[PDB]
């Protein structure tokens, strides 16, 4: 029966490829030929945040565009007030191997996790001023990767065990498991309507998942190596993903095809983080060359370069108001650019 | 009225900074070690003499060491291992005792040695279960490493007075096979510290202590252009 199933799978893949080819009437690079370029984009480091002792692995903006949470390999989370550069909280962690961290959209909770396969949720709204662990989620069989709050009562996590999970924080139980990846799942991105999310893996592929049903709605491919970062286009109709190929790709959910490739002949290093500006016209990508390049989403031309970190740029983030871009690195510093 | 909020924020920042200074001193006073090998190698026996990740703490001559044993992680280790680019050394345990396990260990060592984010860390190499290789060779290397047919024990070898030469030359052949990888690169930024050991011993802690001493001393000597 195995040979018949293999042949059927090949036939279905050919049918899907033909269906995708049927829609390739024109490229984005042709439609956008009549769109004025963004010009030269320049940014300056507006704030530098110090206090971490080791690599900064994760960073996430608050919904008020003023607080930051960052996680370092010292075993600490730091909550900063970006307008004053003062630290608001410092949270010691049970284990120092933290790969992800997340800020709740309500500002009440902070999540983190990493090589201990456990996602810890801390309650910031503490009556005593002492931040305590509000819960631990311990259902994964591999190192924990990007995690994102869906609301105060639900969190979506990904891990190295090839699965994703929707957890109910109130009971500490998994309410949905999303399976179908074969490699480690590296990054999550939630849709602006929090009904779908997109997950990239070490299969050189990404999957669009339906939160409520638990099914995989769409599979996108086109990268040559592992996908390290993924984000949603502001209107929710596209992804931008970065991989170890030293390339970034914009995918369209309705056409079910790769829409644009951002790459350069002089870039042979991988991409660590990807984010969009408020309007979606500027695509920001952090690279292992210790630098972050700014791209023009519509015209795929390099616009500007952010320089200053002296080690690999681990994380990148843009505020909900779009006012500033925060960048983290392995040199233990955060930078807030205009 | 915002002046009072600013003052309170400054006070909280000052408290956080004091705690961070204490934590910085404690962090800088500790050496972190990565332990690799969780197969036929007697890693658990070494750990006993010394959940995604387990931690073991020990002290040698009032120097604190923090060793990290890898727990529930998949066979794919390309992305995970990048978390350990700041350890002082990697402790690699290979059993010298059915597939070519030694070739697999050599390939993993070669991968770790040449990784962009790991090619500054020295490797302390434990060649474990020397007695099972001693038993086997005295009653299978030539069928996996044909060049061993032409290997001769070297001039600086220090075998035990009761060791059969057939065991000495095999142990030193394996050690030289690891050193052949370690010596081909690094430009002096990292070195390998091979050791022979039994599954159960008491000198492992002292040997790790001395290897860390040599690693840090060599790093400092490199800094001052004295080496």
């Amino acid at each position, epitope marked *: 029966e195995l040979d018949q199933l293999r042949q059927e799978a090949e036939q279905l893949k050919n049918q899907i490829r033909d269906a995708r080819k049927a829609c390739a009437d024109a490229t984005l690079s042709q439609i956008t030929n009549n769109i004025d370029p963004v010009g030269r984009i320049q940014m300056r480091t507006r704030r530098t945040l110090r206090g971490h002792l080791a690599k900064i692995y994760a960073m996430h903006w608050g919904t008020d565009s003023r607080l930051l949470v960052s996680a370092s390999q010292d075993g600490k989370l730091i909550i900063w007030d970006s307008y004053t550069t003062n630290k608001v909280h410092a949270i010691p962690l049970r284990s120092s191997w933290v790969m992800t961290c997340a800020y709740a959209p309500s500002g009440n909770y902070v999540a983190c996790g990493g090589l201990d396969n456990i996602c810890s949720i801390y309650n910031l709204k503490t009556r005593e001023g002492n931040v305590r662990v509000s819960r631990e989620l311990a259902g994964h069989t591999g190192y924990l990767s990007c995690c994102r709050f869906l609301d105060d009562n639900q969190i979506v996590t990904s891990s190295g065990d090839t699965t994703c999970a929707l957890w109910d924080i109130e009971t500490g139980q998994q309410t949905t498991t999303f399976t179908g990846h074969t490699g480690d799942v590296m990054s999550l991105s939630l849709a602006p309507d929090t009904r779908l999310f997109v997950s990239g893996a070490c299969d050189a592929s990404a999957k669009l998942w339906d939160v409520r049903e638990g099914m995989c709605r769409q599979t996108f491919t086109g990268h*040559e190596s592992d996908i390290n970062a993924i984000c949603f286009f502001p209107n929710g109709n596209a992804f931008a993903t970065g991989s170890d190929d030293a390339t970034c790709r914009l995918f369209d959910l309705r056409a079910d095809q790769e829409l644009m490739t951002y790459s350069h002949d002089n870039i042979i290093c991988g991409i660590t983080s990807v984010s969009f500006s408020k309007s979606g016209r500027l695509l920001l990508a952090g690279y292992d060359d210790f630098n972050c390049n700014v791209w023009d989403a519509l015209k795929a031309d390099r616009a500007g370069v952010l320089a200053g970190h002296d080690n690999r740029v681990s994380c990148l983030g843009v505020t909900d108001d779009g006012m500033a871009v925060a960048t983290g690195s392995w040199d233990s510093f955060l930078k807030i650019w205009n | 009225d915002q002046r009072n909020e600013e003052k309170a924020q400054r006070e909280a920042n000052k408290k956080i900074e004091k705690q961070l200074q204490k934590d910085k001193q404690v962090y800088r006073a500790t050496h972190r070690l990565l332990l690799l090998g969780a197969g036929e190698s007697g890693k658990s026996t070494i750990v006993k003499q010394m959940s995604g990740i387990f931690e073991t703490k020990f002290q040698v001559d009032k120097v604190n060491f923090h060793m990290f044993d890898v727990g529930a992680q998949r066979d794919e280790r390309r992305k995970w291992i990048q978390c350990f680019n700041d350890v002082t050394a990697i402790i690699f345990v290979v059993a010298s005792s059915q597939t070519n396990r030694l070739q697999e260990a050599l390939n993993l060592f070669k991968s770790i040695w040449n*990784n962009r984010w790991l090619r500054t860390i020295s490797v302390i190499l434990f060649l474990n279960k020397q007695d099972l290789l001693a038993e086997k060779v005295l009653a299978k290397i030539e069928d996996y490493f044909p060049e061993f047919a032409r290997y001769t024990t070297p001039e600086d070898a220090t075998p035990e007075p009761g060791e059969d030469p057939r065991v000495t030359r095999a142990k030193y052949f394996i050690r030289d096979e690891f050193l052949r990888i370690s010596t081909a690169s690094g430009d002096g930024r990292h070195y390998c510290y091979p050791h022979f050991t039994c599954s159960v011993d008491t000198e492992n802690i002292r040997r790790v202590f001395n290897d860390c001493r040599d690693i840090i001393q060599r790093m400092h000597l490199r800094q001052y252009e004295l080496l």
Partner: nanobody
Amino acid sequence: QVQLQESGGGLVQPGGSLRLSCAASGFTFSNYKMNWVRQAPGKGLEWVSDISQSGASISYTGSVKGRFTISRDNAKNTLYLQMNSLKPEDTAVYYCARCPAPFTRDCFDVTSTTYAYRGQGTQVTV
């Protein structure tokens, strides 16, 4: 989409030759170090040989040294393995594997259980 396809095999006699081929589709071939890895029935996966990006550095296993020849053609986008003077212990499923990162010398997850950057392999029975 990265996809590798193997070709060759069949029932062979001990002491004969066999040419295994590996065709690539979905990536640039001349940037990745290439691997040949076998798996015997009843045993796990074991690494046989590798050839570098430009084809300069060629390395083998000691059990297969002097009897196997790994080559690559970056222009024709293919990977060849010549198998002369065979042995009855060499009956295995052969895979052509790709290292995940371009422009590097290290390859971590080539000889692993669930790896997605290699083909389905071919049966070589002596």
